[model samples]
Structures are given as C-alpha cells and as structure tokens.
Target chain A: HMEKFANHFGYNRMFAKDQLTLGVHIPIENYQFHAPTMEKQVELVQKAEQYGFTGVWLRDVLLQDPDFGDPATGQIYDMMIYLTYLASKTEKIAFGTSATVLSLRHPLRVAKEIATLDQLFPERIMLGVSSGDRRADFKALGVSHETRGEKFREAFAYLEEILYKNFPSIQSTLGEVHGANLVPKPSKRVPTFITGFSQQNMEWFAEHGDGWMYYPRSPVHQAGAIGQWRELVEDYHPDVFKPFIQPMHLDLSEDPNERPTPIRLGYRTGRKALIELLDIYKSIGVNHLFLALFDGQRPADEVLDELGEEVLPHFPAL
Target chain B: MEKFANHFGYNRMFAKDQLTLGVHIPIENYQFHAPTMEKQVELVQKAEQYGFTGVWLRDVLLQDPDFGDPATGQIYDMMIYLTYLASKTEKIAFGTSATVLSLRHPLRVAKEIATLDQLFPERIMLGVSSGDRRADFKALGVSHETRGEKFREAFAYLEEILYKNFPSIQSTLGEVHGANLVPKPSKRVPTFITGFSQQNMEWFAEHGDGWMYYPRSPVHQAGAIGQWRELVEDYHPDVFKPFIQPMHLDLSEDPNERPTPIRLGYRTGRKALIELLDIYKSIGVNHLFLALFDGQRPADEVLDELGEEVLPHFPAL
Candidate 1:
C-alpha cells in the first residue's frame, strides 16, 4: 500500500525518469576549517540542485568534546532548519539526514519536524534514524548509555505513532502524552530509513523501517545481505516495497580509464571504473547510492560535471 | 585601574571597528554526512589560527524530516556545540545563527550565555532570533504567530537576568521572583537582533545592541545602513551600533571578471571582489561574513587568497 502510494504520488516515477537520484554530503567544499558560512551553505544547496543532485544530506553533531580539540571542526549548518531553507530555495531535489541519533533526542520533536518538512517539501524528504554512538553526548545530555537500544526502539515507535496517528495516547520512557497530535502531517507516510541495526532485529527493521541504509560493502557481501532483507520482507509482508541505500565515498580521476582503487567505503577511479561500480551495485539490487565527496580532490564542480556527463546516463531514474 | 578604564567613555566600544569576520560550525572537507571527532578539532583550530573572528552554530534537531528534508545536510547543535568550540579557540567570538528565543525559557538562555561569557570572557556575541522554520517551532510546540512578542519579552528578561541579582521579572511567558539568576555575566553580552524578528525599526533600534543582516550589494546596503543609523540616532542621539551582514562568494582566478550575479552572491575575480569589499567599507558596513559554499576554488586556496590579499587591506583590530 505504501509502495502504491509512492507510485501514485510519482516518487517512483520521478526517480525512474531521472535515471539515478544523486545526493551530495554537506560542506560542499573545504572552507578553511571545513565549516561553511550560512550564505555558503545556502549557495551550495542551490548549486547542488542546479547540478541536478536529487538530494542533499546533513549530519548531526551536538557538543564538540574539549578533548576533541577545535570544537568547531568538521561542522556545517544545522540539518532541519537548513533543509527548510533549502526547500524554499530549490525546487525538486530531495533532502535528508544521513542519520540522526534518535536516543539523544525526544521522539515527539522528531515527529513534528519531519511532519513540517513533509508539509513544505511534500515527497522530497527522507528521515534517517539511528541509535547514537557518542559517549560524550550521552554524558552531556545526562542520559543513560546501556539502554540506548531500548530507547532507540521506543523513540522509533513513538515517532511512528506521532506521525501516523492523530491525538493518540502513548506512554513511553520519554514521557506520556494524551491526545497529542503532530501538526503539519505529511502528505504521505514519511519514508524512515533505519541506519544500520540501531540494535533492532532484522525482521523488525524489514517491517518497521520504510527503507534500509547500510554502510558500503562489496557487492558480493551486499547481495547476500540484500537477499536476506528481501527474504525477511517477503516473509513478513509480501507486497511491501523498500529501498536499500548506501553511501559511497568517491574520488573520480581525470583519466577516463583509471582502474578502481580502494579509498574508504568508496573508491578512487576514472569515470569508467565508477560507472562499472555503479552497474555492479545496481545489478546487486541496491536501490540508491549516496556518493560522498569527502576525499574528492577534483573541484566539486568538476566532479559534479563528470557525474552528470558520464555516470548518470546509465542508471535508472525514479 | 586599567589603561582602557575609560574605554566606555570614548563612545567607541560598539563602533563599527568592533565588527569581526566569522565562520559557521561543522568545519570539514567533503566527507561523511556526520563528521568524525578527528576532523572537528582540526578544523576549529585552523579557523582560529587563520584569524577568523568568530564561529556560529545552528540549533537543529531530529534527523530527516518527512516532507522537505533535514534543516542541515550534516548535523550539529547550535548552542551546546558552540560552547565546545568556544573552549578551544582563543580570539574567535561565538554565537548562534541564532537561538530560538521562543522555544527555551529566558532564564535558561540567560544562564547558558552568561556561563559562556564567564568562561570565554569577551569572546561571546549573542544573536537572538524569533525562530524561523515552522517545523522547529512546531517540534518545540511553540506558536509561530507570537514569536515576535515572545522574542522581545525573552530578550528583555535575558538581559535583566544576566546583570541583576534577585532580579524581579514579569512577563506573559514566565515569571521570576526573589531569585538570583546565578553566574551573572562578567560584562553585558553584545546582543544582535537577527532579521526583522517581527519587530519594527523603532523596537530594533531601541532594544537591540546591534544588527546582523543577510547579504546585499554595497550600493543597496548603503541605503539600509543609513536608515539604521538614522533610526539609532533618532532613538538615542549618541548611540553607535555596528551593522553586520553575511556574504556568499565564488571567487574566480582571473582577477578581472566583472561581477556575475549567482544565487545569493556574486561570482567574480579577486580584483572585483576586493573592490566590492572596499566599497562595503566605505558604505559604513562594519562586518562582512563570507560564505564560499559555491566557490570554484579549493577551500585552502580561497582562505589563502582572503588572508594574503583581503586581510592585509582589512586588518583585525
């Protein structure tokens, strides 16, 4: 039914027609300290949209640890507000958080913000939820660390109830609210992609999450994982459709014929090798790929241009 | 007691010269959506060592919103995270892009800012806004309609709480009676009202210590500066307040290309960009916050250009 709705609303159609949907990680380019000014952040989003990037991703960092040294390091603009600003600025590109730590935040707040974005951008937003990892953050918030998995599950369920149900009474560790309704409800059920396990069972993820976002792995390993995911979904709900997405750190070489060279979770190679990699991924049933420009040495514009010119033609659109 | 003991008497403490260039938070290269701790520390020190005057942070929550997208592409908190940055950097002033006055109580804001001021001494600039983004407001369960009124009230209360012990405070929002707002600010926090905040020019000039504005052309901004100054003079004849704005850039290496309007800023050569900065200085513009998101050059290259060419012309106070 959700897949039917996605199709009816043209989410699938948009992706199909567009060939491959592309999203760029934020802090588009290095700006001295890796932090971009608001104006720069805004400009980068506009440019990404112009370059036909299907989405733009934001990250969540709360308190920078003193032991961490320069606290302002590796920072960009805040995600939810930035997306609102970007939604106002751009037309069609989807917006997303690569992952948001649910345990550190309250679920009602999450539901409300997501619902608001849904109102503003309609079908162009995605919510990525994760169990948080930073111990310093837990210490700073004065929250317990051991039951994060439990908290994650509770928050996830609470978020769903708040988003889908109207004025529903819910009781949880976070709090109990009677007849509470999240305003600016989404046009459709918001797509919630579970980031990694978040300590949830595989079947739970297959049933509860709208999609699956995993770290990059070899196609052989991913195929097996995807097969397991598909089998679980089939066993639970035969008709339910879900996307499998992963982030890839890429460094496209100027040489068209350069071979694939390992980087991190991504690769460094020519456009040809990159295309081959994408083909391999698509064949393995990967629904989406988020290309991170983190180690990209080429100019951002150039990398974007290459992707647009060379790699985009081969992939299926929404 | 001090050589600058009569500094307040010179009528220059709040002068335009006090304006400084600042960068926003989460400094990193093209990397993962979330920055690792390794990258965060490296960038902050680099920004300060390079002589940036301040760094800003955003108050964003949740991960991906359903409708549009998340507010920031990468995640970082505005206030709490910036305090960490404050601890690490020496001369760089820190502030929120800004904090939502309506979402949190004035007492909390006052205490947090006061604590930051106490720790960072004179390195804090408080930028308060009436909270944009309907989603953030809805998430916080704060009404968007009354944001302006709440902003004004909260700002007033925060100012009082920071300076007075056992300050009597009353407002439609909250009340404080016979309680000393702890950790009184060492000095008054320089408050800058962001955007219009639903307040009229009279209210802004009367209440705000200064103004932080979005980017506009020098010729166009000159008129705004004049109007702001006129309002300030009208409110208090001798009052001098700084006027600051943010700018976006896409610097070209040619050094001769005429300005081409792109997005929120201009794409031009270093020559034209420098000339524009000079023009801004002449127009009574105090601070120019540069954003290079759409920059064609690399980050280090842009920084080197700004440091070598621009910083010499516009030396720090």
Candidate 2:
C-alpha cells in the first residue's frame, strides 16, 4: 500500500511517514518596498536545486492589489508561464504552486495546461489548490464571491474527472464535456494538496485531497492541528498516510547562537534555534516545510547556503 | 497614424512591398497516417538560424477524426507550446495560426495574451478566429450558432481589457468592474484576423491589426488583397495593415517542376516556387508561411533547400 502511494517523484521526494523535507519559495530574493527586482530568478532557482531543496513553490497572483496587504508573492510572472519556463531550465527539481485559485479559471483550459506541463516534465508537479479569498480578485474577474466554495468544489472535481478518466461526461456549474476528451492525459496522477481550508469541511478534504496545507503556527499548536488531521484521515482511509505541509517566513541572523524573534507569520532566528524548531515540527508530524526568504536581511543565496550546510542535512529530500 | 506600425514581430515578418517567410508547426512529416512530432525544437531552431522570420502553431482543443488535419502539433496545448518554444529560442517570432475565441473565456484569453507579450517582448503575432469545429464547440458546451456574435463580442472584450486600464464592461462571458488584468503588455499584440470569421471585409479589415488570408491564385488573391487595401484605406488612411498568406509546399527534386494546386497551397519545384512567390509579392502580399506537414519529402530537406535557395530571394525585413 505504501509503495503504491509513492508513485510520483515529486510526491515521493517530499512526503513520507515519520519524515520531513524542505522546499524554497520563488522570487528567492531580498526585496525593497515589497517589489522584487524579478531578475536573476533562473540563476536563483538553479542554485536552490543545487542546494538540495526538494521542491520550489510559486504563487498564483493574477492581479496585484496595493490595498491587499502586499502583492501576492511580489513577483510579476504568470504562474503557469514562469513554472513551465523554469521546469525546462532545470532537471529533477520538483515544482509546486503555493496555491492556484481554481475558482477563477475555466476547468478545461486548466486541465489542458496542467496536462501539457505534466507531459513536458514528467512526475514533478505538485498542485496546491485554493478557493481565493481576495475580494478584489473576485471583483476584477466578475466571479461571485458568495459562491466561491461551491465553485472551488465544482472545478476541483471537474479537473479530477477530466484528468483521470477518458471522455468523462461532467455537467456542473462550469459547463459540460461529453463528445470530446481532453488530449494527452497525464502519465500519472498529479497530487492536489488542499490549501487554506478552501471553504471545505474536514471530511471533504480528508477523503478528497492528497494532503492538507495551511499557514504556519507554533510547534505545539501545529501539533494539535496535525493530530486532528491524522484522526480524520485514518477514519476515512485507514493505513494511508496523508501528509501536512506548512509555509513559513524565515529571516536568518549572522550570529549562530541568536534566539528566536517574531516576524510576520514566522521567526527571525539563527541556525541553533531554527534546528531545534524544525526537529519539533518533524516530531509533531509535519511532512514538509517550505520557506520564504523574501524581504529577509540576509541575502537569499547566503541563506540557502547556510540552510544547505547546517539545517537541511537533518531533513534532506528523500 | 499607425498605432502598431512599429511592432517588432510585425516589422520582422511583414514590410510594405517585400514578402518575408515563416514555417508551420509539427516541423515533421504528415501526421494523417503515421504522425511524427519528434525533433520539433531542433527543427524550429534550425529554421530560425536559417533566417525564417516566424513560426506558426495551430490550436486544436480536441481531435475530430472527420477533420482531415491531425490534432495540430499532437497533444500539446498551443499557448503552452508557443511559450515553451519561445523561451528556448533566441529571437524567432512564435504565434498561433489562429486561436479560437468562441470556445474560450475573454478574460482568461486576455490575461494569457498580455502575459505572453510581457514575457517575450521581441515580437508575438496573434491570429484569431470565430471557431469552425462542431465537436469542439459541443464538447466545450458553447453554442455553435451564436459564435458569430460571440466572436465579435469576445474579441471586443479581449481588446478593451488588454489595452485599457480598469475598463468596466459587461457581456455574456462575464464582467470586470473593480479589478484590472495585471502584467500589462508593452504594446498591443498585432492581431491578424483569420479567414472570414463570419464577418464582412470591412469589419475584418478595420478591426484586425492585419489580415491572415488563405492562399489563392494570383488573380483571386490579388482581388482579395485589393479589397483589403481599399477597405483599410477607407477606414484609416495613415494605418498600414498588412496582408499575409500561407502556402503548402512540396519541393520536388527537380528545380523546374510545374506547379499543382493542393487544397489552399501549391506543389512546385524551387525555381517555379520562387517565380510564384515573386508573383505574390507583385500582388502586394506581405508575408507567406509554408505548411510542410503535407509534403512527400522530409521536412528538413524542404527547409534546407528553401533556406539556401528560395529564402535568400526575399530576405526577412
């Protein structure tokens, strides 16, 4: 059963029982005033792969809003174009979307693009899906904010059916597909990890999603949440290991003995405290932890080197 | 007076009097019986290095066996294919032969167009259509009869959203009032309206950035080009919209074989092909891209002879 689960190289590299892997976020840079230079990105990604990161994540930000805290991900490339371009440049480093707002796109086109990417670079796609919450995004695209939950579920199931089955007749809120089939089906199933609730209930994600991903929390708080997720996953599908993933912002210090301090959604610390914290996360059943080095005081390259040498050795890619 | 007269791709492919050349997708042998999609990247790069100005990709959402053409480029989505290929090459222009506007959402299409232009700023052409396949429209659940109206509406919506800022518009596809599409294009992509698109010559001439007309004989095609020039002049005298044509070539081993008509293209030797192309240039055709998928010989062979022999006669502007 376990062997069957570890089919995709992307999934197998970052997920397993009693194991944890690390990933890096894109626009891997130190920014000024929330805007990334968006230059030298290919060099940075290749370096991250060389530094032993299992996966590199990108954000789906169709529109940039000044009022909405910060432009999502602070990078200027479209998710699909950027990822496919990067995938072509590098080899064997897995790529995942931090989350794509499925409710905002047509299902058929999404299926087509994803299938094409899968074929172009086999078994190295980790799709993180979300029902978007940005009111401005919904307003700009003319999608109703009230029905996003329903819309996410509809598009989610449609992609699953369209990607998995041949000539699947799916009639839902989006549209109908009957007479024709989506061409060039994926060689293997691309795993979908649910992001940020997506307005779905516990059992829904437990049964439907390959994994669950969420915002960062304390080691103790995350332990409690992971415990709840484990109970529900076992209730639905026993003997199956459904992983939990978290994304945190890291601002590493020059002093190796520095203590932890709070930053937005994460901590500013040195390798000593960071190592202890990661050990706690793994002990608490976190399967993967991807970091965002944007806006940190230390340069991304230096941080990657430090992490590669000191911390990643403890939790290397499987 | 020309709003898009200085577009890099448009200037590269189409000049006022001279004709430039391009290559079609699948850069391989005919896929009708035993399809081959291998070595397209190497072939396209070779075409560019040999001085072909642009490469065209066909958009086929689903395969219809009744349709004689195999799924264009076989199983890869055209938008993604174009993007991936463009990233790999240095400066070769890549475009959709004609993307179906009726079967897709306007906003999504608008974003894709804008995004591609921003990423690859050198030159990108967009050939658009009011879709013609029954199985495709049915599978995507779009009404076939209403496509004429839908096409016009969608193209209008796509243009406004792409070129305008925070445009408030409403239509059947959807509406965008408060939000704006991001990653704005450096300039509007040159749109070449393909075929009739269920519209009059006036609408096709005035709305399109240029016209991607099918291949025809000198007399018939000259008449079409004359009408396009007149309508475009009447619409805007200062704007210089171009007329582009596609040919299907089967370059025989003999250099002086007589020409034979095949579908919308021709089969002739290199000498006669040059003579025929000169005639098209005399008739005011701006660009001609050859479809080599239907040729009997290897596509690489046709490209080599065309590059060494035919292309030098009408160099890329």
Candidate 3:
C-alpha cells in the first residue's frame, strides 16, 4: 500500500517496507547564515540527481520574522520559482517542499499553483504542508496564528476534494470553492504529506494523510512513533501503508569510522556511523529521510559525493 | 522618467520621445485556446531573440461571455503566467497588458506584485486598472463607481511599501503593521494607468509613470501624446513620461495596401503599417503596443516577417 504512492511518484525505488531513500534539501550551499545563495543551487541539485541521490527538497519560507526568525529568515528565492527552476534543470528526481506555510496564502491560489506544478512534473512532485511556526509571520500578514490549525485542515481537505471530484464543493472558514473547478488538473492525484500535528489530532491524520513526516528522532524513541503510524494506518486505512519521513540536518564528517557529533536535530557523523544510523532507521521503517547538508563542514558537492558513494550503497535509493 | 526605468527591461527599446514595438501574448492561433501552450510558449521564447523588446499579457481573471470574447476562456492567471514566462526566457520584459484590479482585494494584489517583482526584479512592467467588468465585479462583489476610490488607495498603498522598507500604513484594502514586504524590488516597477481610472489628466500625469491609451487614429494619437508631454512639463519639464497605445493588425498579403481602420485597431499591409508607425514616431509618440488580432498568416510567421522586414527600420532594442 505504501508502494502505491511510492511507485506512482517514481519514489518506490527509494521506499519499501525495509528500505529508505535519501533526499537533499535546497539552498544546498553553506552560506554565512541568513545570506542568500542564489547561484549554483541548480547545478548542485542537478549534480545530486547524477550522483544517484533520489530526490531534492526546499522550504516555503515567505517572510523574515524579527522576533524569532534566523537562518529561516526569508533566505531563498520564492519557493515555487526556485523549484520550477530546479525542475527545468533536473529530470525524474522527486521534488518536495520541506513544508509550505499554508495559513498565509489563499487556499485556491495555493491549490492552483500546486496543481500546476503537479501536472508539470507528473508523479515526481509532492507537497509537505505545515501550519507556519514563525509567529511574526501571522502578524506581518495580518493572520491570526490561533486559527491556523483550522485553516490548514480546511485547505488540505479542499485540495484533496478538488483534485479528484468534479466541481467539488467544500464549506469552511478558509473559503468556499464551488460550481467552478480548477482547469487542467494534474496527471495523477498529488500526494500530500503532513509535516506536523498542524493543529489536528493524530486520528484525523491517520484517516486523511498520504504520509506522516516528522523531524529527527532516534530510532529507540522513533520506534514508538513508527508503531503509532503502523497502528494508525491499520486502524484508519486498513489496506494502505503510510510511510514515515524524517528530516535531519546532516553535517557529514569525512572519516567513515568517526563517531557522531551534534548538529540541529541531527549530528556531525562519519560515514560508518551514518550507516549504523540508517540501519536503525530501516529496521524501524522510516520510509525516507530529507538530508539537509546546508550546515556542513565541507563543500556540498564533495559531501554529497561521499554520502552517495559510501552510505547510499548500504541504504540504497529505490 | 521613461529612461529612468530603462535600466532594467527592454525599456531601453524606447527613447525619451521615440516609439518602440511590443506584442500582446498568448501567441497561439486563437479560435479557442489551451491544453498545452508548448508551441506558443516556444514561439515567445523564439520571439525574444527575434529582436522584439518585450512581450505582453492580458489582465483577464475570469470569463465574461457578456463581453469577454474569452475564446481563450479563463486561460492563464497573470502573476504565475508571467512567472512561468520569466523562467523560460532571460531578457524579454513582461508586461501585464493591464490587470483589472477592482474585483479582488488589494492586499493580495500588492503582495503578488511585490513577490513577482522580487523574483523577476528588472523584468516587470506593471499596468493596473479600476475595471468593473460586467460579470467579474458582480461575481466577486465589487463596484465600478467606487472601485476607482479603492484602486487609488491600493495603488497608493503599493507605492509606499515598495518605495521604502517597512512602510507602516493603513488603508481600506489592508494594513502592514511592523513587518515589511520581503525581497522588495530593487527598482520599483514602472506603473501605467490603462485608462483614466476615473481620474483627470493631471492626476495621471502626476501619479503614473506612463499613460496607456487605447488605439486611436495616428493624427489623434499624435495630439494625445502631445498633451501627455505638456502635462509632464507642467509637473517637471526635465522628466519625460511616455504615452503608449495598443494597435491591432491583420497584416494583409499585399505590401502596399492602404490602412482600413477597424474597431480599436486596423487591417493593412506592411507598407502602410510601416508608414503609420513612422508617422507616430515622427510625431513623438513614445511606444506602440501591437496585437496580431487578425493576422491572416500564421502568428509566428507574421512575427518573423515583422522582425525580419519591418523591425530593423525602427529604433529597436
């Protein structure tokens, strides 16, 4: 059942019951912090595909927050434009947003843009959605942060209905879309993976989401999360398998045998220990990992090559 | 003022008091349009190299059968369509032939305009309106008479936020309290009022970077353009604000056929068309926006003929 979506997106090769594929995050270069790397990102992404890395990722950060924002500060090009540029540069590689902040944008426009990208890329594109975490964003755009959970659910469900049903109608606080349908729908149903609770209970997600994605947690702790996902998938979608994805900010050390050091939600680890971590993850059924090397000690291209060569062999891309 | 904005786009194609040529888009052989615009998209990609300075888009958000001629239907959304075009070509400037701004909320418009500006930067030419399309205004629940007031407020709101950073302001449209519009345009895009927008000449002369007038006869066009210059002189004699107008053509097979005026445009052979353009240029009209509304030949071929035959005769970018 998991392979149903994985196979459709050409992601099946990277995802299986016991296998996990790797994805690289964008702003691929390590700039001094909050500085934009507008150039060479496409080349890095193209190179990532050539290196046998299975897919690429980006974030939908819209504005810089003064009270709490940092590296996440509107640090890159508009996500859609950047991704569109990347799609033009690479072929057959899966493209996903780390998370698109849904509350700030009009639901219908978001639906249209995502549908356009889905049709443009066919089975290769997916959306990772979350209620925006940046509090300042709510104030800047004049949105109430308190109601974001409700809005996220509305937009997600709205997108789901419109993509499959003819002139599908939905009534909610987000907006009303009825009578007229979005034109030129995508080639297949666009997969939406929830990035966090997004203000909804796990049960709602179990019944609704294509997949569940969470930030990094060690396999010992992660095992329960995987079990929860399994239990939920069984309870809600009895015949379907929903894969779990974990996003980690990786800083790969050159030595294959070097032990792990600390990074944000991840570690600076040698390739040998990295393989150990993947072993733990695979055993517990973490279907995919979005590897962010933007804070690494070495050049992204070299680190990518090293990971592709030493680590990918053990874990492998689908 | 005209040359001031030239640092970015094919605005270099237009001289202070000289005329330049541009084409309205779709670029499809239009009976009814859509599915994939692959060839049309490809054609415009080729068009930029054909020495045309810029390509244009229509501000049609919805299909209004009462007036829309939407043979193309609710074809393409303006901002993303422009963003889509920008991804394909490097240098051709993108212009909204005009966006009917009244039916929607201005905050979204301002944000989209600002976002497109950040991404495209030097390549955007914005045209705004206070349209009360018979269907859209009602469908969207806005009014024509009062839309002009909201339009003025929205345009003013955009100008403040774009011209500076973190401009705290309030309006009927929306408000920006503390946070600013991200990736602000390095250069504010030049704005044109499609028509008067229910305002007088002085208001346009003072507020607009240019005036976008509809098609008129060459003699009357020359007079209107002269009035634009005089009004600019009243404000600042040193600043040269341009007056641009659109003309539709159905290029005939014969080269020497005379101009036979059609509604809001004309149908004539290349020679007479060239002669008409020369007359406008001689009389100080700054830009002429062209449409292949009824070109008898394939649109791409006509574009090629115009590029290869007539374009070189004019001062093109």
Q: Which candidate is the best by lDDT?
A: 2
Runs of candidate 3 exceeding 4 Å displacement:
A1-7, A10-15, A32-34, A72-74, A164-179, B1-6, B33-36, B59-76, B99-121, B130-149, B171-178, B197-201, B215-230, B257-264, B279-285
Error of 3 at A52 (Å): 2.5
Lowest-scoring 10 consecutive residues by lDDT in candidate 1 chain A?
A: A68-77
Q: Assess candidate 1 and give its lDDT.
A: 0.66
- Superposition-based RMSD of candidate 1 using all C-alpha atoms, in angstroms: 16.5
Q: What is the C-alpha lDDT of each candidate?
A: 0.66, 0.81, 0.70
Cα lDDT for residue B141, candidate 1: 52
| Candidate order by decreasing lDDT | 2, 3, 1
- Writing each residue's lDDT as its tens digit, candidate 2 over B24-121 gives 88777573663556788888888888888899987776655566667534578888888888887887788778888887677667777777887789
Off by over 4 Å in 1: A2-4, A7-10, A13-20, A30-44, A66-74, B1-317
Q: Assess the local accuracy of residue B112 in candidate 1 as a C-alpha lDDT between 0 and 100.
A: 63
Q: Which pairs in model 2 have colliding backbones?
A: none
Looking at model 3, residue A62 earns an lDDT score of 48
| Candidate 2: segments with Cα more than 4 A from true spot | A1-5, A72-74, B2-6, B170-172
